[PDB]
Amino acid sequence: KQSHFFAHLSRLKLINRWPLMRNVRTENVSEHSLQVAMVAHALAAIKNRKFGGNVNAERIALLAMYHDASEVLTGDLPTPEYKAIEKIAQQKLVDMVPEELRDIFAPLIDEHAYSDEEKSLVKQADALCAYLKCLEELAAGNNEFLLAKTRLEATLEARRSQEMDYFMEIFVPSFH
Amino acid sequence: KQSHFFAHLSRLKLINRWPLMRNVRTENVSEHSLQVAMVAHALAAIKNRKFGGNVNAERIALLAMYHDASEVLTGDLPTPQEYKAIEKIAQQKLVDMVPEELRDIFAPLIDEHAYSDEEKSLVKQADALCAYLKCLEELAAGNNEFLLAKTRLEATLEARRSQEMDYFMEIFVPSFH
Known part of the structure; x- marks a missing residue:
């Protein structure tokens, strides 16, 4: 009857990111x-408004909200077959959802269920947010994020798009 | 051309809730x-799935995400009403920061203006539930400062009672110890 799904989700805030480093402020x-x-x-709204997109941007937000949800079960494994830790964890999380509601939550949690465009947008946003954390940490005189900033920059180019270009041009200088 | 909008949103993690009590863990x-x-x-998907709903559950998530956004300008004012006009002012400040070309997208997310009545009601149900869930967390960690808040959030939840919330409470809420 009773599901522990949301009980586990409530632990996301407990999982800390960037653990191999001194953080000026810990990000969960x-x-x-x-x-x-x-x-x-x-990014989705920009792509729709300016670059011919036909994306469900509200859906994209919701995917993004659940994208790292399995980490309540695994912790954060920092990135310098673990996709298999992740797949298992996502399934175990989806198995907690009552059967009658599970088809709602499975494609939110399970990245393999994302369309190629949905996954592109989600992964652009993830890399920019990681990159933005590096700038905040830099701006507060923390040089430990120098390296991370440089590879994030390689990632950002790899995931380059018109909507990212716009975002970077218009919203990112303000993080200095 | 450069907007400070996202630079201000980034600050939401700096604003602390339940300021007048000792918290076992502080919630931002x-x-x-x-x-x-x-x-x-x-609560939207449940209504849809079991109780004859026709709501856009993704829209609802988005709105919820932005419901407290203006608090990056005002901070958090605990629950006691000209403070509504002041929140109205902070919102529009935040809205004014959006590039003109996108502002019609973002404006309705920040101001309680888009919201259809069912849509505003589901977010308020959720906000009350999450306030209540936090009271449960603190109580179960040994913190009695939250009893009183618990008692008054239960009256807020009765007042906002719905089928989909009844479901949520019965299935998902006892597990938070």
């Missing part, structure tokens, strides 16, 4: 995830 | 908004 996955939802929805 | 507005969006979405 719940915070990261809201920021990614917000950036991803903006 | 970013952590709250996410949990509200998750709850709001679930």
Whole structure:
């Protein structure tokens, strides 16, 4: 009868990111995830408004909100077959959803269920938010994020798009 | 041409909730908004799935995400009403920061203006639930400062009672210990 799904989701805030480093401010996955939802929805809106897109931006936000949800079960594995830790964790999380509601939540949690465009937008937003964390940490005189900023920059180019270009041009200078 | 909008949104994680009590763990507005969006979405999908709903559950999530956004300009004012006009002012300040070409997208998310009545009701249900869930968390960690808030959030929840909330409470809420 009773599901522990939301009980586990409530632990996202407990999972800390960037653990191999001194952080001026510790960022948890719940915070990261809201920021990614917000950036991803903006990328989607921009693509629709300016670059011919036909994206469900509200849907994109919701995917972004759940994208790192399995980490309540695994913790954060920092990136310098673990896609298999992740797949298992996502399934175990989806298995907690009552059967009659599970088809709602499965494509939110399971990244393999994302269309190629949805996953592109979500991963653009994730890299920008990671990059933006690097700038905030830099701006507060923390040089430990120098390296991370440089590879994030390689990632950002790899995931380059018109909507990212716009975002970077218009909203990112303000983070200095 | 450069907007400070997202630079200000980034600050939501700096704003702390329940300021007048000792918290076992301090909850920020970013952590709250996410949990509200998750709850709001679930209350919308449940209504749709089991109780004859026709709501856009993704729209509802988005709104929930932005419901407290203006608090990056005002901070958090605990629950006691000209303070509504002041929140109205902070919102429009935030809206004014959006590039003109996107402002019609963002304006309705920040101001309680888009909101259809069912849509505003689901977000408020979710906000009350998440306030209540936090009271449960603190009580179960040994913190009696939250009893009183619990008692008054239960009256708020009765007042906002719905079928989909009844479902949520019965299935998902006892597990928070």
